[PDB]
């Protein structure tokens, strides 16, 4: 039983900003690394960002590297993504997912196990 | 100069004689006990530096920001206009706080390095 | 990008295979080539991970493999219930982290 | 927690209290002998750890692969389902083997580093 | 071989047994004093080596050039055709000079590193 | 009162070399990082090189990186620049200036405070 | 380079501003954007440093600011004496160290 | 008297693999670094790979960097090169040569002293 | 590659020089520019190493030098026996390790 639920999103004019978030339940939040995966209208899937479980290591796809911030709060069981300087090419559904890298003590995955339904961002 | 010769100089100037001071820290029961204790004291400081992530260095900086509540005195005001003996009193009530922060913001680093090395 | 865009199809009850061609080092050197099943309007689900593993809840109908720099997903007793888009993805080696392929749609009839 | 507070916990949780344990290892003839011995013991562990290529670190890792004969017990389901006291017995007959390997696959690294730095 | 087994061999060959020698340096009043002194001696060598910028390494190189006046008897001549016991006499009068240079061309390095880390 | 005075320069044919120097007074020489800035007849200002106060760290703009050497002498209160393999594109006035990086103990500047009048280099 | 080439002008006694447009990370991330006054044939002098500071000897006629990835210099009680070329510059972030802009000329009349 | 003798080679179709080897005598094998040099029919000499004397450090030319392995066995006095994913541009005579880098204790060379006669590889 | 494209020739008993022009940092910074003698069907042999050294077995007939970013090989009392292809090579500074020049054929007559 995994419950990844996205919120936020909506229409932002080019050059603007927004913040997406995902609340999670069922699974211990603090035990998993998380990512955001983008579904552009006609592209299907693109990896955007990855954060480890302690919230200290972040990785980005080069295309958002100077613009986006990924963050976790283990007391709130919340994942979030702060987007800045939005462009038309960023219109997509943004999915909350668990998986990717791990702790070095736990058979790292390098795949995504669970997905939310996705927030829609229109620029 | 020589050992403690820079004691009356400013912190900036005195930071250049650290080698001199370090080399003068190392070399019938009462006298033997004094020698054993000098060794235990020395080793405690070395252990502490190792814990903080600063081993074979006389000068090393870290990721702990300076809190202005810890006696903020500008920057040049300290380095070019204060001796280490005075600085030692300016922040004497904060050394335990600082040391705790120095240890914590090391353990965080060791774990992050261990995880990065696990990526293929 | 991993490549697997042509449409795929077959008769119910017959097997079908969906390929995934990589480049060199991505699927050639890393045995981290998962597959996802995407319904038109739903979040995707994991079907295959590593190269040959499947999570609980995924039946034996789905299996796959890898050779050289090309991976594949095989569906055996093909059902109309398998009409979904399929995507392969793989670990890139810490510089780009993940690469998704250009996926494909499976038609059964 | 405190010193040895994590002794009954899993290896995973216990790995986060290494600082606590390390700080409690280091500080009439028989009493003086005990103090001298504690220092010699401490230094031998530091020397060994330094030889292996792991100096000012509480956690470090190397290029010696784990052999399956050395109590192969999964990873994730054991690391977080076992205490260090239990682990210590699981591999007590292999520590000399492991230590020997840790030194060999260090001396090799020092030679390789020395040669690489010699390339103009 | 074993401890000092390489003493009669060439400098090059003997450089491969440094671990063996290192492990044998470190483990009623007269005997207790001897133990305390052995520890102080050990620590002085470790401190000195650390000052030079060489911490946990058994082999480390630096930025001090070799002066031709310091018995610069070619290169293969000493590494392949000389033992360490002979080398120790060939340059016995220059070790204090060399050590002073090693300390100096470290303090300069630490200052350069401190400044580079201050660039944004 | 700052006294930065450039000398050297002159006309040198392409592929040749010259040395510029700047003598300084008023301000403690040893307390400041120094740099050379190029003023081409049509460019106005181009940064060329920076040296710290101790004379141990030097930085260069890519265009002279394999050709120029910057150095200081704290006893002589002298800054100098050795140019090699001169090209026509190096024709400019070269200014002596104080500023740029600092010591990490002293409120680093990242701007130039004082300027000399400039030596003229024609290739 | 930073961009600010159009000529700038205005009536004596009136304010006038000079822009300085950067790219992104150069002046967006570093608050080190100084300004210099270049008389035609004299060495330039510092007018503004960091973002809003002026050195002693510079009057309050000169002030400035920064927003986004664009900086600006403001001249208030504009004098005939201000006819000089103006340049903005910025810290580059340790790869190129300093960036100068394509500066411009101020006319007062 | 140096005896560097190559074997292996032959005609392999593109995408295939082969292994070359060189046996050697006269000189203490373990005292020298060794390389492979390519003689294409029209290029004469191209450096391909270098291995140090202990067999622990290897270097490659970019063109074979992701494809070839250079290896050494000091008990056998054997140098070898494992080629993979062969392309038409790899047709050449491959020479066993002694030289290149050294031990840091022994007069670094950076030149080749001895050559074998070369195995012929045709793709 | 290093540059030395012309064929080379001279009369018996007369000197001849084979140039080898590099780029900049390769042979300007390093003093490791060796030369090899290649017979048409035999493995090459070392003639010159570093800049001016020769191995035992090579006579004084072969010598050379370097200036700027250009190296050269000179053959003095030139013989019919010297009719071989010649190549220069140089150390690249750990990134490519070695650079070979195209060779040249020597004719003596
Ligand atoms: C700097 O130290 C001060 C205390 O010396 C910190 O301020 C305190 O933060 C705690 C957090 O719960 C509050 O409860 C206290 O009331 C704060 N004290 C005061 C006087 O406000 C301060 O946060 C530290 N600054 C940083 C950047 O960590
Ligand atoms: C793991 O350890 C085992 C022994 O515990 C190693 O296997 C031995 O290797 C020696 C080498 O000649 C053989 O003589 C023994 O008979 C082997 N024993 C067994 C039980 O196989 C093994 O090679 C080690 N594995 C690794 C990867 O180092
Ligand atoms: C190498 O050592 C020699 C001395 O052994 C150094 O030369 C001396 O330098 C001092 C400097 O004031 C002179 O007064 C001495 O007369 C010099 N001695 C000789 C014999 O010339 C030399 O500088 C050292 N070289 C390096 C590179 O440090
Ligand atoms: C002592 O104070 C005077 C004040 O001018 C200063 O010049 C001198 O250098 C100081 N002494 C030391 C040792 O710093
Ligand atoms: C505090 O720092 C500022 C920075 O410009 C400096 O101007 C001021 O004089 C300093 N205060 C003292 C007491 O020096
Ligand atoms: C710092 O400046 C004050 C100014 O009066 C002076 O009295 C004081 O002695 C100076 N401190 C040092 C360490 O020189
Ligand atoms: C430390 O606490 C005492 C308590 O009276 C106080 O007087 C003293 O000034 C404090 N020291 C510092 C550095 O604040
Ligand atoms: C003791 O075991 C229980 C079993 O769940 C565990 O929850 C508890 O944290 C353990 N205590 C320690 C110190 O780990
Ligand atoms: C071994 O590790 C795998 C990793 O998922 C786990 O599923 C399996 O149960 C473990 N086997 C054990 C503890 O026997
Ligand atoms: C490991 O799991 C078993 C399962 O019941 C449990 O009893 C045991 O206490 C666990 N071990 C630790 C160290 O918690
Ligand atoms: C160590 O060897 C003894 C020999 O009897 C054996 O009983 C014990 O279980 C061994 N320990 C391990 C960790 O295998
Ligand atoms: C002693 O000298 C002989 C002379 O050849 C040498 O072979 C032998 O190895 C030397 N002994 C040692 C320990 O190297
Ligand atoms: C230095 O060592 C080399 C090694 O072959 C030798 O040839 C040379 O003659 C030695 N130098 C002198 C001056 O003998
Ligand atoms: C150096 O070479 C000579 C040559 O006879 C030999 O006798 C001597 O023992 C060699 N030195 C060493 C340390 O082996
Ligand atoms: C050291 O000085 C003494 C003084 O007589 C001299 O005999 C000896 O040879 C010197 N040692 C070296 C290594 O020069």
Explain this structure.
The structure is cut from a larger assembly and holds three copies of chain A (123 residues), three copies of chain B (120 residues) and three copies of chain C (109 residues). Chain A has one domain. Chain A is built from no helices and eleven strands. In chain A, 0% of the residues lie in helices and 46% in strands. Chain A starts with a strand and ends with a strand. Chain A is mainly beta. With 120 residues, chain B is an all-alpha fold. Chain B has one domain. Chain B has six helices and no strands. The longest helix of chain B has 23 residues. Chain B starts with 10 loop residues before the first helix and ends with a helix. Chain C is mainly β and 109 residues long. Chain C has one domain. Chain C has one helix and ten strands, in the order βββαβββββββ. The longest helix of chain C is centred in the first third of the chain and has 5 residues. The termini of chain C are far apart. Chains in contact: A-B, A-C, A-D, B-C, B-D, B-E, B-F, D-E, D-H, D-I, E-F, E-G, E-H, F-G, H-I. At the B-E interface, helix 2 and helix 3 of B face helix 3 and helix 6 of E. Bound molecules: a molecule of 2 linked components (NAG-NAG) (3 copies) and 2-acetamido-2-deoxy-beta-D-glucopyranose (12 copies). One 2-acetamido-2-deoxy-beta-D-glucopyranose binds next to loops of chain B.
């Amino acid at each position: 039983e995994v419950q990844l639920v996205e919120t936020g999103g909506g229409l932002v004019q080019p050059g603007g900003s927004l913040k997406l978030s995902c609340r999670a339940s069922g699974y211990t939040f603090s035990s998993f690394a998380m990512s955001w995966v983008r579904q552009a209208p006609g592209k299907g899937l693109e990896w955007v960002s990855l954060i480890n479980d302690r919230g200290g290591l972040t990785f980005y796809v080069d295309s958002v590297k100077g613009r986006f911030t990924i963050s976790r709060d283990n007391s709130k069981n919340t994942l979030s993504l702060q987007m800045h300087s939005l462009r038309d090419g960023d219109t997509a559904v943004y999915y909350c997912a668990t998986g990717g890298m791990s702790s070095a003590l736990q058979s790292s995955k390098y795949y995504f196990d669970f997905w939310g339904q996705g927030a829609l961002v229109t620029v | 100069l020589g050992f403690l010769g820079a004691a009356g100089s400013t912190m900036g100037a005195a930071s250049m004689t650290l080698t001199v001071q370090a080399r003068n820290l190392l070399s019938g029961i009462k006298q033997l006990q004094a020698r054993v204790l000098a060794v235990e004291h020395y080793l405690r400081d070395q252990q502490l530096l190792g814990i903080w992530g600063c081993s074979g260095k006389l000068i090393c900086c870290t990721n702990v920001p300076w809190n202005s509540s810890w006696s903020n005195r500008n920057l040049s005001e300290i380095w070019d206009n204060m001796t280490w003996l005075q600085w030692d009193k300016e922040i004497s009530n904060y050394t335990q706080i600082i040391y705790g922060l120095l240890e914590e913001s090391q353990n965080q680093q060791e774990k992050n390095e261990q995880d990065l090395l696990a990526l293929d | 990008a991993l490549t697997q865009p042509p449409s795929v199809s077959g008769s119910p009850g017959q097997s079908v295979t969906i390929s995934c061609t990589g480049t060199s080092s991505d699927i050639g050197s890393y045995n981290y080539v998962s597959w996802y099943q995407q319904h038109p309007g739903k979040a995707p689900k994991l079907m295959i991970y590593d190269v040959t593993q499947r999570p609980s809840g995924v039946s034996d109908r789905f299996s796959g493999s890898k050779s050289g720099n090309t991976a594949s997903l095989t569906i055996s007793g093909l059902q109309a219930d398998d009409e979904a888009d399929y995507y392969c993805s793989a670990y890139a080696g810490r510089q780009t982290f993940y690469i998704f392929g250009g996926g494909t749609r499976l038609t059964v009839l």
